[PDB]
């Protein structure tokens, strides 16, 4: 239904947040490592 589609969009947003935050954090930390080297 429309409510089910809204729930699917919400799940997609939650997965976006789960996948991007840690990747960006790791990128930043080892970029700091790059800068030190």
């Amino acid at each position: 239904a429309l409510q089910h589609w809204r729930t699917k969009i919400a799940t997609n947003g939650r997965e976006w947040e789960e996948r991007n935050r840690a990747l960006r954090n790791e990128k930043e930390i080892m970029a700091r490592h790059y800068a030190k080297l």
Partner: peptide
């Protein structure tokens, strides 16, 4: 909608991986 948000999800994460 669903198609565009899925495409944005995909290209954002593939950019993250390739930069990594």
């Amino acid at each position: 909608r669903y198609a565009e948000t899925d495409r944005r999800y995909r290209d954002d994460n593939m950019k993250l991986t390739d930069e990594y």
